[PDB]
Design a binder for this molecule. Structure first.
Ligand SMILES: NC(=O)C1=CN([C@@H]2O[C@H](COP(=O)(O)OP(=O)(O)OC[C@H]3O[C@@H](n4cnc5c(N)ncnc54)[C@H](OP(=O)(O)O)[C@@H]3O)[C@@H](O)[C@H]2O)C=CC1
Ligand SMILES: NC(=O)C1=CN([C@@H]2O[C@H](COP(=O)(O)OP(=O)(O)OC[C@H]3O[C@@H](n4cnc5c(N)ncnc54)[C@H](OP(=O)(O)O)[C@@H]3O)[C@@H](O)[C@H]2O)C=CC1
Ligand SMILES: COc1cc(C[C@@H](CO)[C@H](CO)Cc2ccc(O)c(OC)c2)ccc1O
Ligand SMILES: COc1cc(C[C@@H](CO)[C@H](CO)Cc2ccc(O)c(OC)c2)ccc1O
Lengths: 309, 309
């Protein structure tokens, strides 16, 4: 039975990872930091984790030995550290965790906070959005310099942020009458339900086939253009939306005058929806999660959109 | 089937009330405001309410006619509007809801955001903590000046904020070694698990016995002094905490130099734990929730504190 520590256990994807590790059968440990003692929602999330069988490990990123003590308890460490300018962007805090893992010596595998665009492919990304990928690469460099075995989980847009809203970044809900189509809307994007991402993560973290590999989440039925996604919604509702196409030059106009977190998100969106960075390269079945774990009946985007009806 | 609209449905007590209403069998509507369309945890709470059978109603407090249209759908309105300086004290925003209910004309009963100390009894409370009770009284005055039938739910500390921390304000968890005892710690306080508060609310909102009444949540086994609460924890852990008694004047010293939210919390804590405002008066069985609704097997504080072990 694999012992797993989740760092970032109350995060958006982190809490789903915790639940998936428990459902998968791992002996699941969660890092409870003292710094969140007055955040009721985080405190009660940890209580709900206990009720499911998780074990609470106290530790703080400002207490190096507490980190060393925590990772000594487990076989596998999964980090779900924050990495969005709109929420918080603390990817480099994981360097402290890498050091602790190096000192401890017992960790068979480390999964850093990846779960998105594939950082080594983003060398030409727009600033400031490119900071996300630069920092994740710095964490990759530290892992590999330390000889820590790893799995990098990448490649799919979170469904809540990109599918549930028909990729309109101004809201998280489907639009009522009008929709913006980015470019011709014929660039393929990868969408995945975050619960499937979590389940794939829990299955891969002790899979010999993905040791020291990048694992892509590219479920075939969820590789869709934005227009195909919109058309699903039109069919489910029986109502055509009024579409306005946004050319690339207009999408990026006056970016320098927007707030940093919005510039970052605009830049990421551009790489995904105008440059097709999630589909602009092939990946083999031995490095794709839905082929690797075919017992995961992943949620397709029509069933995902059905929850908004 | 009573039709209920919950306003403040993603709130701390509000989400619990939505679930208690659904479990009770009410036809449960929830106000989804457009202003929270970019708050992922709220959006997904609404998705979770839909899955349980709640009906989504769209409206905004800046759109008076949307409020009128929303309350026209239901028999009963429950408001769980925020009311804590540390988390956004917006009690008076409810006046716009009262005005919409007045215009709509069909609402059989309104429960405003009470759920705490009994505001008419707090006329001598310390500033700025008295603002909570002053603003709730203004809402009561507007309800009654509009002729809207009402039920006011009062009288119990939320267990997460006052029991699970042994009433230490700096945290939401029991202390490891030391505990402050406020005064002699022999002043009776009322504690209630918030799921129970939500269940009593769901049961009372269509109870002819509580039309135009104040309903007290005062479960007899949960009327405890702070020392009794601490002794419950000591019995569960097997170990005694080192106790330091804090005299009233030392608790209040230099209150004027604290940030305003902390000043409010100190003042509220003072009335409860030093003046005994939740237990310094008696209430009848026909106005107390545990007698009115004996089938609610309310959680006692030993069972509550066990989830922290
Ligand atoms: N479309 C996609 O593919 C998406 C990809 N992502 C990526 O997923 C990963 C996780 O992102 P997300 O779920 O939104 O993260 P969150 O913003 O939910 O934060 C995750 C956790 O990071 C911890 N955290 C934040 N700051 C600190 C700090 N200074 N010190 C210690 N811990 C801290 C907290 O852990 P704790 O629980 O202990 O409090 C927090 O819960 C990132 O790499 C992100 O880039 C995210 C959104 C979209
Ligand atoms: N020990 C006790 O007895 C306690 C008593 N209370 C009392 O409980 C009641 C609810 O408190 P609590 O659950 O902490 O509230 P929250 O802080 O969780 O907020 C509740 C809801 O208020 C809505 N809200 C906040 N600001 C606005 C605004 N400008 N306009 C419209 N809606 C707004 C939101 O509704 P939405 O869901 O639509 O976004 C929010 O979810 C209060 O009266 C409080 O005093 C609370 C703490 C302890
Ligand atoms: C696919 O890979 C990634 C994707 C992301 C998405 C981030 C980008 O900043 C944010 C949300 O956190 C998306 C977002 C931005 C603005 C919006 O108005 C918006 O509306 C819902 C959604 C981050 C990291 C990744 O590796
Ligand atoms: C019993 O009646 C009420 C009680 C309350 C509790 C409020 C008071 O501000 C807050 C939480 O929201 C309590 C709190 C304050 C500071 C803290 O450090 C703290 O540690 C957990 C807890 C509000 C309204 C009421 O009518």
């Amino acid at each position: 039975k694999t012992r797993v520590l989740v760092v970032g256990a109350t995060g958006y994807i982190g809490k789903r990872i915790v639940r998936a590790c428990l459902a998968e059968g791992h002996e699941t440990y969660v890092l409870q930091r003292p710094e969140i003692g007055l955040e009721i929602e985080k405190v009660q999330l940890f209580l709900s984790f206990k009720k499911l069988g998780a074990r609470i490990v106290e530790g703080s990123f400002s207490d190096h030995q507490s980190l060393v003590s925590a990772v000594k308890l487990v076989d596998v460490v999964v980090s779900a550290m924050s990495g969005v300018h709109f929420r918080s962007h603390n990817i480099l805090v994981q360097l402290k965790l890498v050091e602790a893992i190096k000192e401890a010596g017992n960790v068979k595998r480390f999964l850093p906070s990846e779960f998105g665009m594939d950082p080594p492919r983003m060398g030409h990304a727009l600033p400031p959005g490119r900071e996300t990928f630069d920092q994740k690469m710095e964490v990759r460099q530290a892992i590999e310099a330390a000889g820590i075995p790893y799995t990098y989980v990448v490649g799919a847009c979170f469904a809540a942020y990109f599918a549930g809203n028909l990729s309109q970044m101004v809201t998280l809900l489907p639009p009522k009458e009008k929709v913006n189509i980015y470019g011709d809307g014929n660039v393929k994007v990868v969408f995945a339900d975050e619960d499937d991402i979590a389940k794939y993560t829990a299955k891969t973290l002790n899979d010999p086939r993905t040791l020291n590999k990048t694992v892509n989440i590219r479920p075939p039925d969820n590789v869709l253009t934005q227009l195909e996604l919109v058309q699903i919604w039109e069919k489910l509702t029986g109502k055509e939306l009024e579409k306005t196409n946004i050319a690339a030059q207009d999408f990026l106009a006056n970016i320098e005058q927007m707030e940093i977190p919005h510039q970052a998100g605009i830049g990421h969106f551009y790489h995904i929806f105008y440059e097709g960075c999630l589909t602009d390269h092939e990946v083999g079945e031995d490095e794709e999660a839905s082929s690797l774990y075919p017992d995961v009946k992943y949620k397709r985007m029509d069933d995902y959109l059905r929850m908004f009806l």
